[PDB]
JSON list of C-alpha atoms in Angstrom, two decimals:
[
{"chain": "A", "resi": 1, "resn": "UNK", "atom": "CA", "xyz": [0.00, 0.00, 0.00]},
{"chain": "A", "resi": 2, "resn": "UNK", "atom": "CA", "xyz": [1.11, 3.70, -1.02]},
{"chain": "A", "resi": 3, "resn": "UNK", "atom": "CA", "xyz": [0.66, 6.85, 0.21]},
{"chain": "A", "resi": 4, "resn": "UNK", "atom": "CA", "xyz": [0.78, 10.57, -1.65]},
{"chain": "A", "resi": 5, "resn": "UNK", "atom": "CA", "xyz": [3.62, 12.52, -0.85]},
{"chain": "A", "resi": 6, "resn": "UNK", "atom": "CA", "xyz": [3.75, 16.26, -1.58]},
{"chain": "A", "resi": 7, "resn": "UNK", "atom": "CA", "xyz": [7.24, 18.16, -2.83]},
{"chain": "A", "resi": 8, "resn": "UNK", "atom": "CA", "xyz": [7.91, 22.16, -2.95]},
{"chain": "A", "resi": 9, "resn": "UNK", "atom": "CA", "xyz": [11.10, 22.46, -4.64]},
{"chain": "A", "resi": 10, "resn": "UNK", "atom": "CA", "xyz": [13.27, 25.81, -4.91]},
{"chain": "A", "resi": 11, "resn": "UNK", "atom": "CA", "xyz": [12.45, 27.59, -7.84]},
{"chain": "A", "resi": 12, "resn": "UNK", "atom": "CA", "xyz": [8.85, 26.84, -8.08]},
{"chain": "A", "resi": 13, "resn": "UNK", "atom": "CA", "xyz": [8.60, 23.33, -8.96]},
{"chain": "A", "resi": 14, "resn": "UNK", "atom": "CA", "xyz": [6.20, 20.88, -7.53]},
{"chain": "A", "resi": 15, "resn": "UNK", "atom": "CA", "xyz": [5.18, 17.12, -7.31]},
{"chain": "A", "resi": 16, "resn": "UNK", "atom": "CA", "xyz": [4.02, 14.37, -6.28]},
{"chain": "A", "resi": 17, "resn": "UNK", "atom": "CA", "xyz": [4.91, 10.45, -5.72]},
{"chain": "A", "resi": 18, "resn": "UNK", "atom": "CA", "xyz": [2.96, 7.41, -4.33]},
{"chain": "A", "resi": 19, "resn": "UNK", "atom": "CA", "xyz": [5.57, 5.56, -1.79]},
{"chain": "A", "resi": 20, "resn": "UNK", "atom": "CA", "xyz": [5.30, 3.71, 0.58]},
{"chain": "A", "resi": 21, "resn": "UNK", "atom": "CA", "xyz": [5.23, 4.82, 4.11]},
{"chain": "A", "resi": 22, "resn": "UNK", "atom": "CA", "xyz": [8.07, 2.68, 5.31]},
{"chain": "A", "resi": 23, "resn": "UNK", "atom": "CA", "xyz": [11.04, 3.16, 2.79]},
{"chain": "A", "resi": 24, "resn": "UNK", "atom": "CA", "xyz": [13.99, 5.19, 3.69]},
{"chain": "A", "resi": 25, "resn": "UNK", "atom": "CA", "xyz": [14.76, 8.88, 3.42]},
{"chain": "A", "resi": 26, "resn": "UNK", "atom": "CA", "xyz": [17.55, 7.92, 1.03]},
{"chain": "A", "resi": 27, "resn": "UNK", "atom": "CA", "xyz": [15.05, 5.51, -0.64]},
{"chain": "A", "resi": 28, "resn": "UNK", "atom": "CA", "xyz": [13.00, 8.95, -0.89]},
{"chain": "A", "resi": 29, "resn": "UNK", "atom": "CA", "xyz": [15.60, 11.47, -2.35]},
{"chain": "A", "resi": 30, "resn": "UNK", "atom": "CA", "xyz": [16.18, 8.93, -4.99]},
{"chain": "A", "resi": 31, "resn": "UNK", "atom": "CA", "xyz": [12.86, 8.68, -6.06]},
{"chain": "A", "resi": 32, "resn": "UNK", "atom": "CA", "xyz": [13.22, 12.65, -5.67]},
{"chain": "A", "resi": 33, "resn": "UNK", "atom": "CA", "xyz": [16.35, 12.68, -7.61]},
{"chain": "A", "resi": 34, "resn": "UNK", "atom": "CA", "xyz": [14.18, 10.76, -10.99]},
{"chain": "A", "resi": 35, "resn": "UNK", "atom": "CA", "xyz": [11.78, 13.53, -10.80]},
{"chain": "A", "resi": 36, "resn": "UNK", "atom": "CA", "xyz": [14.22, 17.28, -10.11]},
{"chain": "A", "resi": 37, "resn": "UNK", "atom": "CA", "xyz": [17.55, 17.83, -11.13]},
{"chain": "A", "resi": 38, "resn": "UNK", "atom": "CA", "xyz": [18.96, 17.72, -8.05]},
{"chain": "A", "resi": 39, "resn": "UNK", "atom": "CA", "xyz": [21.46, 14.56, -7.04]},
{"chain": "A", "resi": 40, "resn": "UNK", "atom": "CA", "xyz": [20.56, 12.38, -4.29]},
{"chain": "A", "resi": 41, "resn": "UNK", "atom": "CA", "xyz": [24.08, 14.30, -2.59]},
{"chain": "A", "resi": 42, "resn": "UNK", "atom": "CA", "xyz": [22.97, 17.75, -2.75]},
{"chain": "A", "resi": 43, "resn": "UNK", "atom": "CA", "xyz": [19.27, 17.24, -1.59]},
{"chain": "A", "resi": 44, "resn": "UNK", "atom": "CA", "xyz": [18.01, 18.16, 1.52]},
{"chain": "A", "resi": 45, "resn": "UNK", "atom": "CA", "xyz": [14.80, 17.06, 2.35]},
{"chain": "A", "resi": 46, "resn": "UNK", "atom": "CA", "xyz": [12.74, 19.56, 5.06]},
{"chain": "A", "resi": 47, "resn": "UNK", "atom": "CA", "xyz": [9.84, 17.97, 6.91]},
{"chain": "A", "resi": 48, "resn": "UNK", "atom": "CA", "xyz": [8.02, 18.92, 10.21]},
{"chain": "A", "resi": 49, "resn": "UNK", "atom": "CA", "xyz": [11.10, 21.46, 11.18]},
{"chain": "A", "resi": 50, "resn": "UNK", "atom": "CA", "xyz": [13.59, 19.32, 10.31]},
{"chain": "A", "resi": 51, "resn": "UNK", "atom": "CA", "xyz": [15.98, 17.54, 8.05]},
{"chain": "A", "resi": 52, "resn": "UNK", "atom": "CA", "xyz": [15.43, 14.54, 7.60]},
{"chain": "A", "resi": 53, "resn": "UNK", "atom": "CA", "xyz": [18.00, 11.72, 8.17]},
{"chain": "A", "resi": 54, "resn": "UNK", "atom": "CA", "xyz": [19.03, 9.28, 5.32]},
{"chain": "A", "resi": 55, "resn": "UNK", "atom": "CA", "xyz": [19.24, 6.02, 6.99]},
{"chain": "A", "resi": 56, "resn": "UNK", "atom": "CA", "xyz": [15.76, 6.23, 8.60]},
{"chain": "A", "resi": 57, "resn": "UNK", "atom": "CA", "xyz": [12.66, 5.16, 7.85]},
{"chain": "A", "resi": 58, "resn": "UNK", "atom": "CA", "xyz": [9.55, 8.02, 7.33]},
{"chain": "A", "resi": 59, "resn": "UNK", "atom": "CA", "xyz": [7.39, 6.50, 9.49]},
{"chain": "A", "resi": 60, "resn": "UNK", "atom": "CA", "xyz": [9.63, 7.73, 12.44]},
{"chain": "A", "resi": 61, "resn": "UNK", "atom": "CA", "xyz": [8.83, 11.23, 11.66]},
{"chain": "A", "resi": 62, "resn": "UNK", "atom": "CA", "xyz": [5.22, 10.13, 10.91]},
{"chain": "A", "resi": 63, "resn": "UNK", "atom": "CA", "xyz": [4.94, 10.89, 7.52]},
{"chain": "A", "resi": 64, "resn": "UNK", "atom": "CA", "xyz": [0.95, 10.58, 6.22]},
{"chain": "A", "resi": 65, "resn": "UNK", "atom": "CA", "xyz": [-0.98, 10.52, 3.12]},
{"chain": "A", "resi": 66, "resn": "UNK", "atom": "CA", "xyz": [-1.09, 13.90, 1.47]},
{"chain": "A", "resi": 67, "resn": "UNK", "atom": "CA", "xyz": [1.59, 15.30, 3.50]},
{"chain": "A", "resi": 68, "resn": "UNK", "atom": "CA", "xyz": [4.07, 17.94, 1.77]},
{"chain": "A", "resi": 69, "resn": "UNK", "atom": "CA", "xyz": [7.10, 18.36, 2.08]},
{"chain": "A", "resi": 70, "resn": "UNK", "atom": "CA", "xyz": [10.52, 20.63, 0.59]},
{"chain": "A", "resi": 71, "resn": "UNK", "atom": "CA", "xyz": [13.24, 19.37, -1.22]},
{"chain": "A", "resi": 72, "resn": "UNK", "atom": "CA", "xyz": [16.12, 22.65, -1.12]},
{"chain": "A", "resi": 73, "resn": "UNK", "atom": "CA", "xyz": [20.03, 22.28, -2.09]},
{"chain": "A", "resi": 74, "resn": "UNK", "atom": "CA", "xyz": [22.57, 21.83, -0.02]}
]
């Protein structure tokens, strides 16, 4: 099962991706990274104050359906 995830991107881009809830953050920026041109190494992905950490999963920071999110550069 999938859930909608939400991106604001710097320099007014925006989309959106069906994951699921449990893959990594690094699983996440390279799903990111085949939709922006922005490498998985430069991305910083901002969520609920914070950026979030590679090697954990997004439902520690309990990501939900329809949430949004930003992806900025390092």
């Amino acid at each position: 099962m999938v859930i909608n995830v939400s991106f604001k991107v710097t320099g007014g881009k925006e989309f959106t991706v069906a994951i699921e809830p449990d893959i990594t953050v690094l699983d996440l920026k390279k799903i990111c990274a085949e939709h922006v041109d922005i490498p998985v190494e430069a991305q910083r992905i901002i969520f609920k104050g914070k950026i979030l950490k590679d090697k954990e999963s997004l439902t520690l920071y309990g990501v939900a359906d329809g949430n949004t999110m930003h992806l900025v550069r390092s």
